[PDB]
Design a protein around this ligand. Structure first.
Ligand SMILES: CC(=O)N[C@H]1[C@H]([C@H](O)[C@H](O)CO)O[C@@](O)(C(=O)O)C[C@@H]1O
Ligand SMILES: CC(=O)N[C@H]1[C@H]([C@H](O)[C@H](O)CO)O[C@@](O)(C(=O)O)C[C@@H]1O
Ligand SMILES: [Ca+2]
Ligand SMILES: [Ca+2]
Ligand SMILES: [Ca+2]
Ligand SMILES: [Ca+2]
Ligand SMILES: [Ca+2]
Ligand SMILES: [Ca+2]
Ligand SMILES: [Ca+2]
Ligand SMILES: [Ca+2]
Ligand SMILES: [Ca+2]
Ligand SMILES: [Cl-]
Ligand SMILES: [Cl-]
Ligand SMILES: [Cl-]
Ligand SMILES: [Cl-]
Ligand SMILES: [Cl-]
Ligand SMILES: [Cl-]
Ligand SMILES: [Cl-]
Ligand SMILES: [Cl-]
Ligand SMILES: [Cl-]
Ligand SMILES: [Cl-]
Ligand SMILES: [Cl-]
Ligand SMILES: [Cl-]
Ligand SMILES: [Cl-]
Ligand SMILES: [Mg+2]
Ligand code: NA
Ligand code: NA
Ligand code: NA
Lengths: 234, 281, 57, 264, 281, 48, 57, 48, 57, 27
């Protein structure tokens, strides 16, 4: 025989190995392929689809359809409308979005996050809303005058129903970790009345908006891992 | 091919309003940072290599644990411990199943790997010679064994692997074997149409993929006759989808499975932990 | 019948593949496919939507 | 002059107009089509009924209330008793179809609410007994044009025989996934301030070229109130939702005597 | 490429004074023998091949010793002996650590090798069948096992190696996996900025690389069920940096380590042995 | 020797495998073939 | 003396064979032979029968 | 199979060996390199 | 795709490498790199210092 | 080489009768 010498690794089963193996059904004639709509090539294609943030997952609304709609009214309170950390894998509200679910199969993420808001009041309701992203390392914003010092957009409610706020990729590390982590903290997303919602008479004075999250084309993930979102009894 | 670079952009004062849209259309938000902030040029050298379907599925996952024993069996129950049969499925475990169920349809070849372990049942019953295992793939229709040493194990046509304890985990490839042009992960239907005034039972019939799926049976035995020492074995079955295509993405499983279907369990349908307030960082 | 292809870059070249088996099912993983068209899911609209234009005109 | 809001759809002898649309969805970017010779399976010359069957059928309307949890239909089940489409479906072993789905819901500039309209391939739903799995009767799975409703409570049956229906739990999309992720499926939203209609054009979707329509629904149609109906002068007001669906590029194989499914 | 040859040179009587310099500049002495003595020509054929970074680091070094056992566990403490978890680090041992810490930053691929050994805990409890080991790499975020036979070991996505006792030491390569452009051997900082008047504890917080480093977890089990004979195992983990680059050289560790940081121990900070006199040959 | 590393499947006997194996009767001179009527190439010929 | 041949198609190229042994009996399976002539069993008639013509004229 | 014959050294772990081994994280996209000051190539640079 | 390179000399030629794996991380040791620039550590001065000239003029 | 494709054909009204045969022939 050809003289050979076995190296370390010999006979191991590495579950991420990539070797050939003999076919149990040789000369098998596979069913011819046909075109099927909706072919997927990359999990990041799915990450670019908007899914609803369960933004109002408070006691009595968590695990109901009422966890999604963000309460709005015509009272013009100075208190924030919602506040959430840019922790898209680990946050109690972001982790169950389509993007969150994909991120929980990976260890590392990079790129820009898109937050799209749909106003679902009456056509007769007007308003201006400030949407802010504050990169980390300063007092988390709880007032409009702190929020407006960060990355922000002033949304005018009107015929165009929806407004997109970006959390642009602003990070020390080239990747953040898909866990709660001080070192790779992402910062603070907040929302304030810029003016107030105004309605005429005979119109609902309370209403909702829906918040969606998706990945931008600059977004990628690394280091495949098991998710903490599925388990079974043994 | 890389993920998107960021172009150098300054401000705008314009009738062009990329920040506004209407998601009623069924389009997701499309705006990127250069649409709503001043951006520097950043060259992106990073790739989506590890989120291709081949990369996402490129792992051998445990799909079941089988048990077989080798001892002098004197009862029907003990004779049935000398071999095991398993209807081939990915629904005994949750991890690979959940990944596949991001998709409605798939087409792949399968790498199957096995990990075989033993222990002595007792001491002071002497020892056991090294055991050889037979893992026989029984396609639908082929006769199933009723004893560890019946005629079916001669396996003239069924593929069998003979594995020697202590050797490298055994492994073989299976082609895409579906009778359709893809595997269905979900089937919204029945195996037959129940007809007006027929006498056939409609009270105990099932629904979905369980009514139509059949990938045959894995039969496992220890080939050796019994030693004085009873040996108990586990066979862990591993599947890796390779040469993968998938169609029609789905929301992933959010709550525990309770069987082969999409059914959920009343005590396990509250996946979210309530936040203290809508304003909690 | 050796295929020579680019490796995935590490910390700091090419690799060789020969297929040993008569069935393609026996082959190692498919080569990296960077194909994508997110628009079939993110923008499956009949009429083109220009980002800078109003979504509804 | 031309607007994303104003649309005409003509199929056969039937026309729809809308003046408050929001574009139209073509599911997975693919228009329906006939089955090519290079993808064909059954070898008999198919029936292509064209205008007799490929036309708008309007289902019974449902009422949207502040308390509604949502509605579902299956296709082709919802159209099984619709004119010549139903006859062609039941006289043949095999059928394939695309669809134009037009969901209609008008209100006023003073009403508010938002409907998610989703087309779901292989819309498999949970059963309503924990004594069994995948335990749904044909009759309960195939309600026809009346469809079904979602609930915000899961109350599985004491006895297996009483739970052979779907547990259509709204926030789990009746199938153990979070409803907020339903947007991965082809969809539009009817947001009353913006639009009064949703239009989805669906190609045939299956792991086969053609299949048994009486055994197998290719699509679910889900309408979920994402934001509840509200009207300040009367919180108890109801507005209709009307579903109008046209089969497209219908093709049938395996002609014989008519299929008459069990009704109990 | 060779180390420097010596040129033929005679004496000088010159205003050129290569013997004098001023190290205040931050320049080291530069003069060579030909500057200060008469030299013959010597051709130097010798090379610095064995002091390249690849040569210096081109060794598999033991970085930890793990323990696992296989026996019938009836207590929580004994159940926890059936598997082990280890946060991946090079700080359990001193030799490879000290070599890496000649540098501030590095970039390398890793060869990991394992040496697995067993002994019988006792005689007169019979024997044990040959054992299979699972070594599972759990990246940060992936679920960690709480029992040797829980669902996590199905390892659908985590890389696992199944090793059969008596086979060649198992081995695999790991890419450069750093989330920065290099590994940091030293990090003069914190994981977060503590802010004015915040309620977050500042009394029990840590400093340096330990606050930011996470290379995940190695989980090890014996796959076999228990024999009557208790078997105890050691798993020695070996690391070899390959395809090595390093930046920013440092003085090497002069005194014993006392943990993962640069801290020193009061009884072990006197590395020099005093000489009898400044004039001791 | 040439450095090698055994993969999963090593030493298994798969009954549908398709490998070479050493000949127990090397240099054996097989009986020359002759034409026999009724040669079959495919089981589907018999199905027709 | 490597043979490069087409593989049997799977779900979604070529393979290489080298014979290691001096006896053809040692070789792997014969290559797929799609030869057939069902007529030697299904129609072994002396006089040609045209399907569209009467079997007996 | 190709006839082979194992030589002395077979299955040993020599800590100064220099062999290939399978990658536990196939298709992994390493962080792009950037220029860092103070790169060292040889321990003799430090000795000078 | 065989690389033929010079061996390190012994007491008294070339060797062949084929990469078997699709990841460069799997490769054997990097080839000997004799690169060096001690001056970045031994003489990192802004103004050139000529050995024969005074260090301070 | 594949199993037989099916050609596009319509009806007939013909003295060509491929449906009838005589298996007495041994065909
Ligand atoms: C599977 C199991 O628990 N086996 C145990 C047996 C059984 O209890 C037998 O019934 C009696 O031998 O008893 C032991 O004391 C023994 O034989 O040494 C320990 C052994 O681990
Ligand atoms: C780890 C260890 O020290 N094991 C020793 C055991 C233990 O002390 C048990 O408790 C009692 O068997 O005792 C021995 O006499 C034995 O069993 O033959 C020697 C053995 O080496
Ligand atoms: Ca060998
Ligand atoms: Ca726009
Ligand atoms: Ca800009
Ligand atoms: Ca036996
Ligand atoms: Ca027609
Ligand atoms: Ca000088
Ligand atoms: Ca001199
Ligand atoms: Ca164990
Ligand atoms: Ca005839
Ligand atoms: Cl291989
Ligand atoms: Cl709650
Ligand atoms: Cl075992
Ligand atoms: Cl037998
Ligand atoms: Cl099948
Ligand atoms: Cl909280
Ligand atoms: Cl009906
Ligand atoms: Cl030991
Ligand atoms: Cl397991
Ligand atoms: Cl890192
Ligand atoms: Cl001294
Ligand atoms: Cl061979
Ligand atoms: Cl090697
Ligand atoms: Mg009807
Ligand atoms: Na780029
Ligand atoms: Na020299
Ligand atoms: Na053909």
């Amino acid at each position: 025989g050809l003289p050979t010498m076995l190296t370390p690794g010999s006979s191991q089963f590495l579950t991420s190995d990539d070797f050939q193996s003999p076919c149990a059904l040789p000369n098998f004639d596979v069913t011819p392929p046909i075109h099927i709509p909706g072919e997927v090539f990359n999990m990041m294609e799915l990450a670019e689809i908007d899914s609803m943030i369960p933004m109002n997952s408070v006691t009595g609304k968590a695990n109901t359809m009422e966890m999604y709609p963000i309460p709005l009214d015509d009272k013009g309170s100075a208190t924030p409308i919602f506040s959430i950390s840019l922790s898209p894998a680990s946050d109690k509200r972001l982790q169950y979005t389509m993007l969150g679910e994909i991120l929980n199969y990976y260890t590392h993420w990079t790129g820009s996050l898109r937050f799209t808001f749909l106003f679902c009041g009456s056509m007769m309701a007007t308003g201006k809303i400030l949407l802010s992203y504050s990169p980390p390392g300063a007092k988390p914003p709880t007032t409009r005058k702190d929020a407006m010092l960060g990355t922000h957009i002033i949304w005018d409610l009107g015929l165009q129903s929806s407004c997109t706020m970006l959390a642009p990729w602003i990070s020390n590390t080239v990747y953040r970790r898909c866990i709660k982590d001080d070192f790779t903290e992402g910062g603070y997303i907040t929302c304030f009345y810029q003016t107030r919602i105004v309605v005429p008479s005979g119109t609902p004075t309370s209403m909702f908006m829906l918040a969606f999250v998706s990945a931008c084309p600059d977004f990628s993930v690394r280091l495949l891992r098991d998710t903490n979102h599925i388990s079974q009894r043994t | 091919p890389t993920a998107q670079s960021t172009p150098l952009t300054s401000g705008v004062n314009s009738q062009e309003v990329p920040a506004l849209t209407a998601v009623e259309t069924g389009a997701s938000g499309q705006a990127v940072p250069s649409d709503v902030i001043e951006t520097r040029h950043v060259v992106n050298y990073k790739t989506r290599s590890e989120s291709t379907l081949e990369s996402f599925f490129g792992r051998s996952a445990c799909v079941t644990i089988l048990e077989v024993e080798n001892f002098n069996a004197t009862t029907d129950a003990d004779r049935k411990k000398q071999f095991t049969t398993w209807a081939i499925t990915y629904t005994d475990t949750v991890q690979l199943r959940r990944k596949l169920e991001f998709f409605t349809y798939s087409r792949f070849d399968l790498e199957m790997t096995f990990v075989i372990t033993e222990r002595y049942y007792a001491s002071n019953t002497g020892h056991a010679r090294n055991q050889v295992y037979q893992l026989m793939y029984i396609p639908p229709g082929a006769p199933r064994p009723t004893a560890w040493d019946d005629y079916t194990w001669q396996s003239s046509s069924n593929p069998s692997v003979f594995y020697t304890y202590g050797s490298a985990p055994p492994r073989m490839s299976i082609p895409y074997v579906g009778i359709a042009n893809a595997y269905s992960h979900f089937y919204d239907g029945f195996a037959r149409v129940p007809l007006k005034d027929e006498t056939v039972d409609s009270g105990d019939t099932y629904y979905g993929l369980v009514t139509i799926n059949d990938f045959g049976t894995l039969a496992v035995r220890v080939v050796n006759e019994y030693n004085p020492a009873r040996i108990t074995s586990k066979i862990r079955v591993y599947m890796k989808p390779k040469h993968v295509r998938c169609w029609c993405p789905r929301p992933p499983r959010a709550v525990p499975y309770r069987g082969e279907g999409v059914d959920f369990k009343q005590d396990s349908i509250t996946p979210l932990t309530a936040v203290e307030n809508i304003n909690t960082f | 019948g050796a295929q020579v292809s680019s490796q995935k870059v590490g910390a700091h070249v090419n690799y060789t593949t020969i297929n040993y088996y008569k069935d393609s099912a026996s082959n190692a993983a498919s080569k990296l496919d960077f194909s994508q068209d997110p628009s079939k899911f993110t923008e499956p609209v009949k009429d083109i939507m220009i980002k800078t234009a109003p979504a509804l005109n | 002059g031309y607007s994303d809001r104003v649309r005409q759809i003509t199929l056969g002898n039937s026309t729809i107009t809308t003046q408050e649309a929001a574009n139209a969805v073509v599911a997975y970017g693919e228009w329906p089509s006939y089955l090519d010779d290079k993808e064909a399976n059954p070898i008999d010359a198919p029936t292509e009924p064209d205008v007799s069957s490929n036309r708008f059928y309007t289902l019974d309307s449902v009422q949207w209330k502040s308390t509604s949890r949502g509605w579902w239909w299956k296709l082709p089940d919802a159209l099984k008793d619709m004119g010549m489409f139903g006859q062609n479906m039941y006289y043949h072993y095999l059928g394939r179809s695309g669809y134009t789905v037009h969901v209609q819901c008008n209100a006023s500039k003073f009403h508010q609410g938002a409907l998610g309209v989703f087309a779901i391939p292989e819309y498999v739903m949970a059963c309503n007994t924990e004594a069994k799995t995948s335990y749904v009767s044909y009759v309960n799975a195939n309600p026809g044009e009346k469809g079904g409703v979602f609930d915000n409570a899961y109350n599985p049956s004491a006895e297996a025989s009483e739970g052979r229906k779907f547990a259509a739990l709204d926030y789990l999309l009746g199938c153990g996934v979070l409803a907020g992720n339903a947007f991965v499926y082809p969809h539009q939203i009817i947001n009353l301030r913006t639009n009064n209609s949703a239009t989805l054009v669906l190609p045939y979707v299956n792991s086969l070229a053609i299949d048994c329509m009486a055994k197998h629904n290719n699509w679910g149609l889900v309408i979920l109130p994402l934001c509840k109906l509200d009207y300040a002068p009367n919180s108890s007001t109801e507005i209709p939702i009307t579903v109008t669906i046209a089969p497209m590029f219908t093709e049938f194989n395996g002609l014989r005597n008519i299929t008459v499914p069990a009704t109990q």
